[PDB]
Amino acid sequence: AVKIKLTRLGKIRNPQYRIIVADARTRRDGRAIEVIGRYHPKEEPSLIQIDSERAQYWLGVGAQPTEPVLALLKITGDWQKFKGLPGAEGTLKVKEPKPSKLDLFNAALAEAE
Amino acid sequence: ARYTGPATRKSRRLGVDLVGGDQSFEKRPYPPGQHGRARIKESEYRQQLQEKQKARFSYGVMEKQFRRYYEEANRQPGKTGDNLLRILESRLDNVVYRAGLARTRRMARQLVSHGHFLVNGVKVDIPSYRVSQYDIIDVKEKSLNTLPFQIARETAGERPIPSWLQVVGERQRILVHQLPERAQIDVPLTEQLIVELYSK
RNA sequence: GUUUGGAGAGUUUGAUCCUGGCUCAGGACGAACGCUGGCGGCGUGCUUAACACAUGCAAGUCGAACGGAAAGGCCCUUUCGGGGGUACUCGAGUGGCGAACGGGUGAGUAACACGUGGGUGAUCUGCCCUGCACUUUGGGAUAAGCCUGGGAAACUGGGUCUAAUACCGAAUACACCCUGCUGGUCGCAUGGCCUGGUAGGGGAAAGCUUUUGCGGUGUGGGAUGGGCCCGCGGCCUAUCAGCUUGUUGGUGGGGUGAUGGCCUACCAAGGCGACGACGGGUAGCCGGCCUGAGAGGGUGACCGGCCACACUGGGACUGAGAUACGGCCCAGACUCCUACGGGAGGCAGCAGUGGGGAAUAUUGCACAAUGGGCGCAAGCCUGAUGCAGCGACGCCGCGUGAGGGAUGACGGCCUUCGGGUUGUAAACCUCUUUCAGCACAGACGAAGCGCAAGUGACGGUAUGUGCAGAAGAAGGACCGGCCAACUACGUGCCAGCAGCCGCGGUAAUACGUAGGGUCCGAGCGUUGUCCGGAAUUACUGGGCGUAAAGAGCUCGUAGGUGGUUUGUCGCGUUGUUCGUGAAAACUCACAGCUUAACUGUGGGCGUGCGGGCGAUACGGGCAGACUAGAGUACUGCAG
Ligand SMILES: [Mg+2]
Ligand SMILES: [Mg+2]
Ligand SMILES: [Mg+2]
Ligand SMILES: [Mg+2]
Ligand SMILES: [Mg+2]
Ligand SMILES: [Mg+2]
Ligand SMILES: [Mg+2]
Ligand SMILES: [Mg+2]
Ligand SMILES: [Mg+2]
Ligand SMILES: [Mg+2]
Ligand SMILES: [Mg+2]
Ligand SMILES: [Mg+2]
Ligand SMILES: [Mg+2]
Ligand SMILES: [Mg+2]
Ligand SMILES: [Mg+2]
Ligand SMILES: [Mg+2]
Ligand SMILES: [Mg+2]
Ligand SMILES: [Mg+2]
Ligand SMILES: [Mg+2]
Ligand SMILES: [Mg+2]
Ligand SMILES: [Mg+2]
Ligand SMILES: [Mg+2]
Ligand SMILES: [Mg+2]
Ligand SMILES: [Mg+2]
Ligand SMILES: [Mg+2]
Ligand SMILES: [Mg+2]
Ligand SMILES: [Mg+2]
């Protein structure tokens, strides 16, 4: 069966995962049919991106998600949408963008002067 | 590693001021040792080599790290000599020296290494840390009243502060508006000889 | 269009110029060796014997298929020796699925093995997804159990007995498979399509569960994974010139999922080769890596993709799928057991042992994370994997202190006996404790998992906050010229040095030591290996009068090359667009680790190849024209 898996990238103690469509038999770090997303658990909130157009196609043809990929598809709303259930908007959290560096430079200029 | 041996003998061999406040250099501007007076045969290689030695023993960078700096400078789109100089100028121990909070680049290194500075609110004790545009460098609370740093506050004036740096507060807060262009950088060295040395 | 990119030196001579080889300075490594050695991050580690292998693990799982009841549990019961029931549960066994993946190694292979691009009107595809139809009806066994036999053991026979989603017969299916006839249509010749129409014959199933409920059969489409065929591309060797008779082609059969001498009978006499056939040698191939200005050269460790093999050789079986590493059968070598009749093994899985060698690690800890197998699920399994241990083996980062300190100590070493060096160095005087040390806090990785409410192997690690005190932390090579750095003493062609030229013959900047110096630094040197320098195999980019080099001279075969001009094709060439050129790597940008190494994201790169469309100057093909090249004719002529 063709499945949607996490493949491990990154270095020791820094697991970064790509969301890939691959045959069940293929080894984890093996050739993938498509990369449809990425998942970085070490972040807060863990980084999640999914190409929803491709996720819908692959679930349509019958790709079977793995357990963690199924959790991610529910957060993104791609699972609920594919099935017809509600919640398609999803509950995806995004990291608050840190203050821009230029603005903090202006802040320091004003503060001291 | 670091070079921790005598500092004057290096400036004496190279015939130029590295610390620039050194009385023992001006007293004996000839190279060190028994034969330091004797006539040395000229060669282009010795000239190129000594310009490299002036660079790396001014900033306190080992040859391994300095050669990586060269490759980056040559890779960068500008002219290699300007890129190399401003990369070494971006070093945090150098920025601290240019700001005035230290007496010597050796003193600047020790301070940064011992954990007295913060960059954009995060502690950095890496002397080779390269500052970028709009970096803000601050002093931790414990080291603000620290006796040599107190000296540094009321010893402002030893050297001039370059335009890309700016000390804005009595907290001794350093701002970097940009990386220095070659004109901004003022160093007793001919950079074109080092580019030629590594093209050998 | 276009800058991002090329350094040389020594050595033939009395001297010179040239030619030409040799040698050196650079970079790289799955390294080894010598001296030396503080810490951390991230990688990496049998290159030799595809040598032999002690020991433990590396593949199981399902009571929601089944009879059952050895262990637990619960319920009777007791005398307390045991004996029943239940089926929550579960040993052994039947049955299903998995075991063909994942992991290892590079022996073989010079081949459609691999890379890249196509073809299949010549094909298969379990589980997964999504339409349609269905899931009717009977039957006979057997493992396990119990009794008993044979055998030293491995194992094995007989009787009796039981069940199923195990096995087996029939009906139905008319989507599907086979055959005959026949209509339309699309091409690329076999042919393909219209589930075309029509006649005749034929092809299945299985139940369980009471809960997020799971299943079974045929058939249409999809997705995935393949099979087979072909163009083009990447080693040395004619001191290897002929090779081939299922061999080359055809027809009738056989065989396969499918095409095909794949097999077979007959018939024809072909097929492949100096565009190196057939031999010999070597070698897994590639993305990439190293070097290089580039072109090129070398290389294929790790990581990623294919292939091949699994003690050696041969064979098939089961299955959707098999080089079947931890399956089976046979033969051989080797090890072991035996009652001598006969049996049992296979680390090129992980760890480990012996051996070979200059040389390469622990008989760790977890399934917490990611991937995989089974299960409705809870879960179980997983030496995949995530981590830990060991080796400066590599890369990167940091420390071994900072400021001040004199006409400048002692001591060492030179000397023109004036001193001069070491040297601001040291002593001393203050200043900060990074990394180590001693305390106290203490993770992220888990919008996970179980929803029962507990759950992180790494780990009380990383990282924060306190304390004490410069406190614990520098070596290696070189110093004649290349090539940075010079003197004294000791031996005097000796002992020794050396990459090359060359240094040692009682005054050596070359030997050994010392002082001083230089280059690098937790490393520094040496050896081996590849590229560079080497325009020294020269496509970019060289030569042949005398330096190495014109065949003794012709003729001519293949091949290479081609005057002027008209038209045409659009093969070479050129433009454009689309497809492809996996990821990683590389490169540009940007972000994340305190920085960096490293890691991630988005462009470019991927020079190529295939399809469509455009141009026709030039090369080429095709059809013509012309006479200046070439040849002929005629008239003279010399030898
Ligand atoms: Mg280092
Ligand atoms: Mg091996
Ligand atoms: Mg059981
Ligand atoms: Mg296998
Ligand atoms: Mg059956
Ligand atoms: Mg036939
Ligand atoms: Mg081989
Ligand atoms: Mg070259
Ligand atoms: Mg079969
Ligand atoms: Mg084995
Ligand atoms: Mg097996
Ligand atoms: Mg092993
Ligand atoms: Mg040995
Ligand atoms: Mg899992
Ligand atoms: Mg679950
Ligand atoms: Mg086990
Ligand atoms: Mg010199
Ligand atoms: Mg060459
Ligand atoms: Mg060479
Ligand atoms: Mg020549
Ligand atoms: Mg000629
Ligand atoms: Mg000659
Ligand atoms: Mg001749
Ligand atoms: Mg010809
Ligand atoms: Mg022509
Ligand atoms: Mg021709
Ligand atoms: Mg790629």
Curated annotation (Swiss-Prot), chain A:
The keyword Acetylation does not apply. Transmembrane segments: none annotated. One of its GO terms (biological process) is translation. Keywords: Ribonucleoprotein, Ribosomal protein. GO terms for molecular function: structural constituent of ribosome. GO terms for cellular component: cytoplasm; small ribosomal subunit. The keyword Ribosomal protein applies. Belongs to the bacterial ribosomal protein bS16 family. This is Small ribosomal subunit protein bS16. It comes from Mycolicibacterium smegmatis (strain ATCC 700084 / mc(2)155) (Mycobacterium smegmatis). The lineage of its organism: Bacteria, Bacillati, Actinomycetota, Actinomycetes, Mycobacteriales. The chain holds residues 2 to 114 of 156 of the full protein.
Swiss-Prot record, chain B:
SMART domains: Ribosomal_S4 (SM01390), S4 (SM00363). It comes from the Bacteria. PROSITE patterns: RIBOSOMAL_S4 (PS00632), S4 (PS50889). Residues 1-41 are annotated as: Disordered. One of its GO terms (biological process) is ribosomal small subunit biogenesis. Part of the 30S ribosomal subunit. Contacts protein S5. The interaction surface between S4 and S5 is involved in control of translational fidelity. This is Small ribosomal subunit protein uS4. It comes from Mycolicibacterium smegmatis (strain ATCC 700084 / mc(2)155) (Mycobacterium smegmatis). The gene is rpsD.
